[PDB]
UniProtKB/Swiss-Prot annotation:
It comes from Homo sapiens. Disulfide bonds join C6-C128, C30-C116, C65-C81, C77-C95. The active site is at E35, D53. This is Lysozyme C. The gene is LYZ. Lysozyme C is capable of both hydrolysis and transglycosylation; it also shows a slight esterase activity. It acts rapidly on both peptide-substituted and unsubstituted peptidoglycan, and slowly on chitin oligosaccharides. It is linked to Amyloidosis, hereditary systemic 5: A form of hereditary systemic amyloidosis, a disorder characterized by amyloid deposition in multiple tissues resulting in a wide clinical spectrum. AMYLD5 primarily affects the viscera, and the predominant clinical features are renal dysfunction of varying severity, and intra-abdominal bleeding. Inheritance is autosomal dominant.
Length: 130
């Protein structure tokens, strides 16, 4: 599914993401916006290393989920990458929380650095009641 902006904001808040490991909801929203356009079924194949990015947060199969077809991969979220393509984002949120429990935090998503870091991200939660 493609979330509407404020629908996603409230969904993420109910799943405990506001301030998780210090990350504001608006940062999670900025991440989802620029990774997938709020699209839970999005996939991106990376021909350079044979990995695939999955779901609304475009979490990568080399380290975080298992899709069986990524060489030399691990599965730190202990999920099938299929779980990151559901309309219900609970599993994707659990995996995103696992990602940011590692040292880089939200910087683990390279695109967050380019699109959200040191930027005014509040527009993404304006009017959503969060
Ligand atoms: C949290 C996450 O999945 N980050 C992955 C990162 O590890 C990978 O090296 C980059 C390259 O495509 O994609 C994403 O940023």
């Amino acid at each position: 599914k493609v979330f509407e902006r404020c629908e996603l904001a409230r969904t993420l808040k109910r799943l405990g993401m506001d301030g998780y490991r210090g990350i504001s909801l608006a940062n999670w929203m900025c991440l989802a916006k620029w990774e997938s356009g709020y699209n839970t079924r999005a996939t991106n194949y990376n021909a350079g290393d044979r990995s695939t990015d999955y779901g609304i947060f475009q979490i990568n199969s080399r380290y975080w989920c298992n899709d069986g077809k990524t060489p030399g991969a691990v599965n730190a979220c202990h999920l099938s990458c299929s779980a990151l393509l559901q309309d219900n984002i609970a599993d994707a949120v659990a995996c995103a929380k696992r990602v940011v429990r590692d040292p880089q935090g939200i910087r683990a998503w390279v695109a967050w650095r380019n699109r959200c870091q040191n930027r005014d991200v509040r527009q993404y939660v304006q009017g959503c009641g969060v």
